[model samples]
Target: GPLGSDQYIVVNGAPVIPSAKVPVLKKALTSLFSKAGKVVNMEFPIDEATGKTKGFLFVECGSMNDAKKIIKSFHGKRLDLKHRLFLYTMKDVERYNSD
Candidate 1:
């Protein structure tokens, strides 16, 4: 099975912006769901050994509608004219992983 295109990542130093960093990534993501609905939670996995961002986040929206909106708005869209963005449902990621 192929990796879920829905699962998104914001790679640091990938030039998603002029000078992308943690705050920039957080702000960019926060703005997307700010108007659509409540963001239930967000998680950014880190490499504790190195004390650095894994460069991606998992966002949980309060409603499925908001998740759909996010996917529609960002999936396959290029950021900083290069790094493409994506979003996915947890079920989708789980199924993809299990396969």
Candidate 2:
């Protein structure tokens, strides 16, 4: 699919620190993503049984352009000392899922 057709980006490798609350983690992620573009939506999947994040999240940008910019700027970049970010378009993820 054309890059412009994909606006949903998945980001992995966000640190799941024991002391970090969900809001705190969201704030930290928002700070970084806001610099890339207008973030339309953010979803973090929490493990209800464990009460912790699953270490990845879904981000929806206002436009495909912003999504591309975010991947270019942050994919594989380090978020913290131990965690390096991994980003992929949801379209690409769908391809993987089908396999």
Candidate 3:
């Protein structure tokens, strides 16, 4: 209810329409997912060198299944009038080493 879909574009390998929002994206996630859990956080472009964010996001769902499901369902959905968005599992996004 704040604004925008997860505050950033939650895509996975290119978007389809690329004109969708968070609510719409959420609808897709919870469509048949009951235990889709809570979305901890989300940021676009997760940094690799600085460990920040370039244009990616970080989302923590209730269950890994839910989290994993979201990654699968929207693997290649529409976004911002475009097609095929990139979605990655932050679970394995190796943290940056600038500390």
* Per-prediction TM-score to the true structure, in the order listed: 0.61, 0.82, 0.44
Model 3: lDDT to the true structure: 0.44
Q: Cα RMSD (Å) per model?
A: 6.5, 3.6, 9.0
lDDT of each: 0.56, 0.81, 0.44
Best of the candidates, lDDT:
2
Model 1 segments more than 4 A misplaced: 1-21, 35-37, 94-99
- The sequence of per-residue lDDT tens digits that candidate 1 reaches over residues 1-99 is 133333332222322222226576667667765665455566566666665666566776656666667666666667656566655566556556777
The Cα error of candidate 2 at residue 30, in Å, is 1.1
Error of 2 at 56 (Å): 0.4
TM-score attained by model 2 = 0.82
lDDT per residue (tens digit) for residues 4-99 in model 3 = 332222444421223334445445534433343345444344334554324334455555555666666666556447545556554333333222
Model 3 TM-score (2 dp):
0.44
Which digits, one per residue and each the tens of the lDDT, describe model 2 over residues 1-99?
Answer: 333438889999987654348788888788888898777878788877777788899888878888888999899998878899999888767577767
Model 3 clashing-pair count:
41
lDDT leaderboard ranking:
2, 1, 3
